[PDB]
A paper describes a structure:
Omalizumab is a clinically approved anti-IgE monoclonal antibody that binds to free IgE, also with high affinity, preventing its interaction with Fc∊RI. Instead, the Fab alone selectively crystallized in different crystal forms, but their structures revealed intermolecular Fab/Fab interactions that were clearly strong enough to disrupt the Fab/IgE-Fc complexes. Mutations were therefore designed to disrupt two recurring packing interactions observed in the omalizumab Fab crystal structures without interfering with the ability of the omalizumab Fab to recognize IgE-Fc; this led to the successful crystallization and subsequent structure determination of the Fab/IgE-Fc complex.
This omalizumab-derived Leu158Pro mutant Fab was termed FabXol1. The Leu158Pro mutation alone was not sufficient to prevent selective crystallization of the Fab, and the structures reported here were the result of unsuccessful crystallization trials of the complex between FabXol1 and IgE-Fc. CDRH1–3 residues in both molecules of the FabXol11 structure adopt essentially identical conformations to those found in the FabXol1 and FabXol2 (wild-type omalizumab Fab) and scFvXol (omalizumab-derived scFv) structures. We mutated Leu158 from the omalizumab Cκ domain CD loop to proline (omalizumab-derived mutant FabXol1) to disrupt the interface with strand G from the Cγ1 domain, and although this was achieved, the FabXol1 molecule still crystallized preferentially, in different packing arrangements stabilized in part by the presence of Pro158.
Numbering used by the authors:
A (entry chain H): 1 to 135, 142 to 221
B (entry chain L): 1 to 216
The structure:
Amino acid sequence: EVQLVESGGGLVQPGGSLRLSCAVSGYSITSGYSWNWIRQAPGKGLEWVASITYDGSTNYNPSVKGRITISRDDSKNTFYLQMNSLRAEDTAVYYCARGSHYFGHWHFAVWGQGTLVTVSSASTKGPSVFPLAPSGTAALGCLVKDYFPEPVTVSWNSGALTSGVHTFPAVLQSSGLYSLSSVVTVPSSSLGTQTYICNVNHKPSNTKVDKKVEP
Amino acid sequence: DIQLTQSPSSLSASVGDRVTITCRASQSVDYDGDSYMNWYQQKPGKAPKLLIYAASYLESGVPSRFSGSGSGTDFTLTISSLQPEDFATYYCQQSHEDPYTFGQGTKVEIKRTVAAPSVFIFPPSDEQLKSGTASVVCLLNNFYPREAKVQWKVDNAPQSGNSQESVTEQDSKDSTYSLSSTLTLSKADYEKHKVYACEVTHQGLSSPVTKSFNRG
C-alpha cells in the first residue's frame, strides 16, 4: 500500500523558516498526478496551500504565495515544503496529499499523518509527570504538567493497557504552557495484583518518563 | 475564490438514523457533465479520509452507507444509517479551480441514551507539592450528553477562576464522553485549607454528586 510519512515539523521563531518532508513508500513519486500540502490550524478547517504536478509545474495559494516553495526529489522518492518569513498564522498541522489522474484531479485520496509547526518565541519546556493515585471500579491516572510545545503522547503499560483509557486533550494554561492528563478505570480488585505505569513522551524536549502509579 | 458553506455546523442523531449534510458553493462547480464537489471525514487526531468524489462517486473501500448528490452549486452528503464509529467532522471541498477550498466542516455525534457520570477526585501528589504547586483533579467518566457542570469547593467556599476543564471526543465503544476539571493552587494556599470537594451536576443525576477529601 502507498504510505506518506511526514517529518520536519517543530517549533520555529517568528520570521524563521521551516522545511517539511514527505517520504513516499509503496509508490513511485513520479507516478502521482500531483503532490500537495494542506494545513489545519488548531481547531480550524483545512487550507490547501501548494501543489506540484507530474510535469513539475507548481502552484500556490495566494494566501501564502511569495514565501512558500514546493519541490520534489525523485531519487529519494520524497517531496518538500519550504516556508520562510513565518508568522503566527502559519502555526498548523501540515498534511501532504496525493491528487488523482481522474475526475478533475484535485481531490485527495491519500494523506500523510500530519506534522505540527508551531511559530512562537516561547522556549521548549519538558513536562513534569505526577500520579493520580487510586483511592467495584477504581480510577487512576497521570497528570502531565507544564510543557511546550505540543504534542505529548501517553501510553499505559507500554501499550498493553488500552481498555478504559481516556487521554484528555491538552489545555493551554494562562502561563502559556500546556497540561493534560490520562486516566484509566480498572477493577478495584486488580489494584493489588496489577502494575500500572504511564509512559509519557515529549519528543520536542527529549523527555521520556515512565511513572508507576500505585495506591 | 469559490466559497463553500455547509449546513448544519453540527448535529446530533440517534444511532442508526439517516444524517443529511448540505454544501452550497458561491459559483457552479460543474464541468463537462460532472460536478467537482468532494466530501471528507476527519476523526480526531487523524488525517481526513476521502468519502465521495465528483459529487456522487463512492471512494473505494468506504462503506456504502455514505452517498453524495447534487450539481451546480448545491450538494448533499447522506449517511443512510449512522454508526457509532461515524463521530467525526465532515468537510465538503470543491476541485473545480484553485485554490481548492474546503467548507467549514460539520461535526456529527451520536445521540445515545442519557448516562450519568462516575465521579472521582484526586489530591495533589506529594511529589508535586515539593514544587510549590498543587493540582486537584476531578474526573467525570463515561457520561452522555457532553454538557455537565463542575463546581469546586474548598472548606465549603465556592471557587471561581482557578480551574480548567478538558473533554474527550465521543468514544465509539459506547458513545460516551469523559471530562476532567483541574483546580490549581499554590502549595501555601493548599495547606491553608482542609476540605476539597467537587460537586457535579448532569442531566443523568437527579441531585448533584459531590466527591471530596480532607487534606491529610
